[PDB]
Design a protein around this ligand. Structure first.
Ligand SMILES: *[C@@H]1O[C@H](CO)[C@@H](O)[C@H](O)[C@H]1NC(C)=O
Ligand SMILES: *[C@@H]1O[C@H](CO)[C@@H](O)[C@H](O)[C@H]1NC(C)=O
Ligand SMILES: *[C@@H]1O[C@H](CO)[C@@H](O)[C@H](O)[C@H]1NC(C)=O
Ligand SMILES: *[C@@H]1O[C@H](CO)[C@@H](O)[C@H](O)[C@H]1NC(C)=O
Ligand SMILES: *[C@@H]1O[C@H](CO)[C@@H](O)[C@H](O)[C@H]1NC(C)=O
Ligand SMILES: *[C@@H]1O[C@H](CO)[C@@H](O)[C@H](O)[C@H]1NC(C)=O
Ligand SMILES: *[C@@H]1O[C@H](CO)[C@@H](O)[C@H](O)[C@H]1NC(C)=O
Ligand SMILES: *[C@@H]1O[C@H](CO)[C@@H](O)[C@H](O)[C@H]1NC(C)=O
Ligand SMILES: *[C@@H]1O[C@H](CO)[C@@H](O)[C@H](O)[C@H]1NC(C)=O
Ligand SMILES: *[C@@H]1O[C@H](CO)[C@@H](O)[C@H](O)[C@H]1NC(C)=O
Ligand SMILES: *[C@@H]1O[C@H](CO)[C@@H](O)[C@H](O)[C@H]1NC(C)=O
Ligand SMILES: *[C@@H]1O[C@H](CO)[C@@H](O)[C@H](O)[C@H]1NC(C)=O
Ligand SMILES: *[C@@H]1O[C@H](CO)[C@@H](O)[C@H](O)[C@H]1NC(C)=O
Ligand SMILES: *[C@@H]1O[C@H](CO)[C@@H](O)[C@H](O)[C@H]1NC(C)=O
Ligand SMILES: *[C@@H]1O[C@H](CO)[C@@H](O)[C@H](O)[C@H]1NC(C)=O
Ligand SMILES: *[C@@H]1O[C@H](CO)[C@@H](O)[C@H](O)[C@H]1NC(C)=O
Ligand SMILES: *[C@@H]1O[C@H](CO)[C@@H](O)[C@H](O)[C@H]1NC(C)=O
Ligand SMILES: *[C@@H]1O[C@H](CO)[C@@H](O)[C@H](O)[C@H]1NC(C)=O
Ligand SMILES: *[C@@H]1O[C@H](CO)[C@@H](O)[C@H](O)[C@H]1NC(C)=O
Ligand SMILES: *[C@@H]1O[C@H](CO)[C@@H](O)[C@H](O)[C@H]1NC(C)=O
Lengths: 135, 135, 135, 135, 135
C-alpha cells in the first residue's frame, strides 16, 4: 500500500488558518507549486504461468477418514443467571449492562483446506472505537 | 491500495479558513498550481496462463469418508435467566441492557474446501463506532 | 483501490470559509489551476487463458461419503426467561432493552466447495455506527 | 474501485462559504481552471479463453453419497418467556424493546458448490446506522 | 508499505496557523515549490512460474485417519452467576458492567491445511480505542 493515513482532525497541503478573533492585517501571499506524481504499480511481465494439481487413487482401501477444517466450537455452555430478591430496599441502577458475545469487525479472506494462490492480497482496517460512554 | 485515508474533520488541498470573529484586512492572494497524476496500475502482460486439475479413482474401496468445512458450532447452550421478586421496594432502572450475540461488520470473501486463485483480492473497512451513549 | 476516503465533515479542493461573524475587508483572490489525471487501470494483455478440470471414476465402490460445506449450526439452544413478581413496589424502567442476535452488515462473496477464479475481487465497507443513545 | 468516498456534511471543489452574520466587503475573485480526466479502465486484450470441465463415471457403484452446501441451521430453539405478576404496584415502562433476530444488510454474491469464474466482482456498502434513540 | 502514518491532530505540508487572538501585521510570503514523485512498485519480470503438486495412493490400507485444522474449542464452560438479596438496605449502582467475550477487530487472511502461495500479502490496522468512559 503506497499511502495509508489516519489523521484525527485536519489534513491539508497548504493551510492559512485564522481562528479565534485574530487581527489579519496587510498580507500578500504568492504561492507557485508544480506537483507531478507517476504511479507504476503492480505491472507484471509474465510469459507462462501454470497452476496444476493431479490426484489418482488405485487399488486402495480407505475406511474412517475424517478431515475437519478450522474454527469448530463443538460444545460450549454459557450460564449467566441473575436473581434479585428485595424485601424493603431502595435500588438505583444507572448505566448497567451485560454483554456476552459482541463482535464488531470480522474480516476473513481465505479459509480453506487446500489453496493455491498467485496474486496479491491486502486487508486494511481503520476505525475510531468508543465502547461505553455514560454520565 | 495507492491511497487509503481516514480524516476526522476536514480534508482540503488549500484552505483559507476565517472563523470565530476575526478581522480580515487587506489581503492579496495569488495561487498558481500545476498538478498532474498518471496512474498505471494493475497492467498485466501475460502470454499463456493455465489452471488445470485432474482427479481419477480406479479399483478403490472408500467407506466412511467425511470432509467438513470450517465454522461449525455443533452444540452451544445459551442460558441467561433473570428473576426479580420484590415485596415492598423502590427500583429505578435507567440505561440497562442485555445483549447476547451482536455482529456489526462480517466480511467473508473466500471460504471453501479447494480453491485455485489467480488475481487480486482487497478488503478495506473504515468506520466510526460508538456502542452505548446514555445520560 | 486507487482512492478510498472517509471524511467526517468537509472535503474540498480550495476552501474560502467565512463563518461566525468575521469582518471580510479588501481581498483580491486570483487562482490559476491546471489539473490532469490519467487513469490506466486493470488493462490486461492476455493471449491464451484456459480453465480446465476433469474427473473420472472407474471400477470403484464408494459407500458413506459425506462432504459438508462451511457454516453449520447444528444444535443451538437460546434460553432467556424473565420473571417479575411484585407485591407492593414502585418499578421505573427507562431505556431497557434485550437483544439476542443482531446482524448489521453481512457480505459474503464466494463461499463454495470447489472454486477456480481468475480475476479481481474487492470488498469495501464504510459506515458510521451508533448503537444506543438514550437520555 | 478508482474513487470511493464517505463525506459527512459537504463535498465541493471550490467553496466560498459565508455563514452566520459576517460582513462581506470589497472582494474580487478570478478563478481559471482547466481540468481533464481520462479513464481507461478494465480494457482486456484476449485472443482465446476457454472454460471446460468434463466428468465421466464408468463401472462404478456409489451408495450413500451426501453433498450438502453451506449455511445449514438444522435444529435451533429460541425460548424467551416473560411473566409479570403484580399484586398492588406501580410499573412505568418507557423505551423497552426485545428483538431476537434483526438483519439489516445481507449481500451474498456467489454461494455454490462448484464455481468457475473469469471476470471482476465488487461489493461496496456505505451507510449511517443508528439503532435506538429515545428520550 | 512505502508510507504508513498515524497523526493525532494535524498533517500539513506548509502551515500558516494564526489562532487565539494574535495580531498579524505586515507579512509578505513567497513560496516556490517543485515536487515530483515517481513510484515504481511491485513490477515483476517473470518468464515462467509453475505451481504443481501431485498425489498418488496405490495398494494401501488406511484406517482411522484424522486431520483437524486449527482453532478448536471443544468443551468450554462459562459460569457467571450473580445473586443479590437485600432485607432493608440502600443500593446505588452507577457505571457497572459485566462482559464475557468481546472481540473488536478480527482479521484472518489465510488459515488452511495445505497452502501454496506466490505473491504479496499485507495487513494494516490503525485505530483509536477507548473502552469505558463514565463519570
Ligand atoms: C497596512 O495597514 C495599515 C492599516 O493600519 C495601512 O494604513 C497601510 O496603508 C497598509 N500598508 C500596506 C502596504 O498595505
Ligand atoms: C513558477 O514555477 C514554475 C516552475 O514550473 C516556473 O517556471 C515559473 O517561473 C514560476 N513563476 C514564478 C512567478 O515564480
Ligand atoms: C509486453 O508488452 C510489450 C509492449 O508493452 C510487448 O511488446 C511484449 O510483446 C509484451 N510481452 C509479451 C510476452 O508479449
Ligand atoms: C470407524 O469409527 C467408528 C466410530 O467412530 C467405529 O465404530 C468403527 O468400528 C470404525 N471403523 C472400523 C472399520 O473399525
Ligand atoms: C489597507 O486597509 C486600510 C484600512 O484600515 C486602508 O486605509 C488602506 O488603504 C488599505 N491599503 C491597501 C494597500 O489596500
Ligand atoms: C504559473 O505556473 C506555470 C507553470 O506551468 C508557469 O508557466 C507560469 O509562468 C506561472 N504563472 C505565474 C504568473 O507565475
Ligand atoms: C501487448 O500489447 C501490445 C500493444 O499494447 C501488443 O503489441 C502485444 O502484441 C501485446 N501482447 C501480446 C502477447 O499480444
Ligand atoms: C462407519 O461409521 C459408523 C458410525 O459413524 C459405524 O457404525 C460403521 O460401522 C462405520 N463403517 C464401517 C464399515 O465400519
Ligand atoms: C480598503 O477598505 C477600506 C475600508 O475601510 C477602503 O477605505 C479602502 O479604499 C480599501 N482599499 C482598497 C485598495 O480596496
Ligand atoms: C495560468 O496557468 C497556465 C498553465 O497552463 C499558464 O500558461 C498561464 O500563463 C497562467 N496564467 C496566469 C495569469 O498566471
Ligand atoms: C492488443 O491490442 C493491440 C492494439 O491495442 C493489438 O495490436 C494486439 O493485436 C492486441 N493483442 C492481441 C494478442 O491481439
Ligand atoms: C454408513 O453409516 C451409517 C450410519 O451413519 C451406518 O449405519 C452404516 O452401516 C454405514 N455403512 C456401512 C456400509 O457400514
Ligand atoms: C471598499 O469598500 C468601501 C466601503 O467601506 C468603499 O468606500 C470603497 O470605495 C471600496 N473600495 C473598492 C476598491 O471597491
Ligand atoms: C486560463 O488558463 C488557461 C490554461 O488553459 C490559459 O491558457 C489562460 O491564459 C488563462 N487565462 C488567464 C486570464 O489567466
Ligand atoms: C445408508 O445410510 C443409512 C442411514 O443413513 C443406512 O441405514 C444404510 O444402511 C446405509 N446404506 C448402506 C448400504 O449401508
Ligand atoms: C506596516 O504596518 C504599519 C501599521 O502599524 C503601517 O503603518 C506600515 O505602513 C506598514 N509597512 C509596510 C511596509 O507595509
Ligand atoms: C521557482 O522554482 C523554479 C524551479 O523549478 C525556478 O526555475 C524558478 O526560477 C523559481 N522562481 C522564483 C521566483 O524563485
Ligand atoms: C526484463 O525486462 C526487460 C525490460 O525491462 C526485458 O528486456 C527482459 O527481457 C526482461 N527479462 C526477461 C527474462 O524477459
Ligand atoms: C517485458 O516487457 C518488455 C517491454 O516492457 C518486453 O520487451 C519483454 O519482452 C517483456 N518480457 C518478456 C519475457 O516478454
Ligand atoms: C478407530 O477408532 C475407534 C475409536 O475412535 C475405535 O473404536 C476403532 O476400533 C478404531 N479402528 C480400528 C480398526 O481399531
Amino acid at each position: 500500500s503506497i499511502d495509508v493515513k489516519y489523521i484525527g482532525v485536519k489534513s491539508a497541503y497548504v493551510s492559512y488558518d485564522v481562528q479565534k478573533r485574530t487581527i489579519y492585517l496587510n498580507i500578500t501571499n504568492t504561492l507557485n507549486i508544480t506537483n507531478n506524481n507517476y504511479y507504476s504499480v503492480e505491472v507484471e511481465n509474465i510469459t507462462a504461468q501454470v497452476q496444476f494439481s493431479k490426484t489418482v487413487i488405485g487399488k486402495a482401501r480407505l475406511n474412517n477418514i475424517t478431515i475437519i477444517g478450522p474454527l469448530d466450537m463443538k460444545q460450549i455452555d454459557y450460564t449467566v443467571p441473575t436473581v434479585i430478591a428485595e424485601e424493603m430496599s431502595y435500588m438505583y441502577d444507572f448505566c448497567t449492562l451485560i454483554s456476552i458475545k459482541v463482535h464488531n469487525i470480522v474480516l476473513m479472506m481465505q479459509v480453506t483446506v487446500t489453496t493455491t494462490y498467485f496474486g496479491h492480497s491486502e486487508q486494511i482496517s481503520q476505525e475510531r472505537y468508543q465502547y461505553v460512554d455514560c454520565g
